Design a protein around this ligand. Structure first.
Ligand code: SAM
Ligand code: SAM
Lengths: 149, 156
């Protein structure tokens, strides 16, 4: 059971159904096949990853090209969703889930601010991600600092 | 039903995952045209109501905490690919509330915490918008977990 929690942690017994549905709009390809190999957070000088946007949404890439700084939203598909208190250092220092950027969340939405190296059709070659190879894409937006000074 | 120059997808498939509404955001704006395009730090005070189930997860958030607030734009059509928010633009190239997954964010500082309620300025959503996540904003958060090999990996 990946169900066990660390000392100091707290899991919710909540078992309701979802209120809305998320569509996976692409797939993110990265160097990392194991969670323990992933960066905690991406770095802008990091390895090139490839965001493959699915064919339905290709026209929505209009305006994104080489160099565009993006806020990339992805679904952390391996994460449990029930933790309320977490101890990211496994030392009994428990923090509310909303006070940390842990991938374990009620809605496991991850973001990275990441600049497109190169675009080739549906593929965005991009630096600055931190997710497992094959992580689902859920949204792309222009980063605030570049889009709105 | 769209403007000349826009493009919609005629895609109709089931969702791949489910989103849980963890709260509700209470704001001054009852109509879409009343909402600011983006939130401002000196805008009207709003109330983020976190539902009972997730109250314990607010531990560590208090007056003065800088948050990244994620909400579900529940009134948005999800099919637009080119939009005229002026030449039409790709949906992914703008911060429009009309998106395949209509997730909005605002970066805003908690003015006051009271139990499951956060009183906060800098939002832009319709009164009654569902909350989907809260994170400490990057500008004021330092990751707690220890470094991993990926943290040291620089690209060629
Ligand atoms: C700390 S989270 C930060 C996510 C994002 N940078 C953010 O701030 O929202 C990054 C971690 O999520 C984990 N992870 C990466 N891909 C994942 C996936 N697809 N499902 C669940 N966990 C994942 C890895 O342990 C990685 O180190
Ligand atoms: C331009 S979007 C930006 C959202 C967020 N600040 C971001 O950058 O991700 C803000 C607009 O979304 C619209 N809106 C607000 N709440 C909504 C809701 N619940 N459903 C659909 N549209 C909404 C309003 O027109 C508002 O001006």
């Amino acid at each position: 059971a990946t169900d066990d929690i660390r000392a100091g942690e707290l899991a919710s017994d909540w078992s309701g159904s979802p209120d809305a549905g998320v569509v996976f709009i692409g797939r993110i390809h990265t160097p990392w096949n194991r969670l323990k190999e992933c960066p905690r957070h991406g770095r802008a000088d990091g390895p090139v990853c490839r965001i493959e946007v699915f064919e339905t949404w290709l026209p929505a890439l209009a305006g994104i090209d080489d160099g565009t700084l993006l806020e990339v939203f992805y679904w952390l598909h391996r994460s449990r969703r029930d933790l309320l208190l977490q101890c990211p250092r496994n030392d009994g220092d428990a923090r509310g889930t909303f006070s940390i950027r842990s991938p374990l969340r009620p809605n496991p939405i991850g973001t990275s601010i990441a600049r497109v190296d190169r675009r080739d059709g549906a593929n965005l070659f991009i630096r600055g991600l931190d997710c497992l190879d094959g992580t689902p894409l859920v949204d792309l937006k222009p980063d605030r600092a570049e889009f709105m000074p």
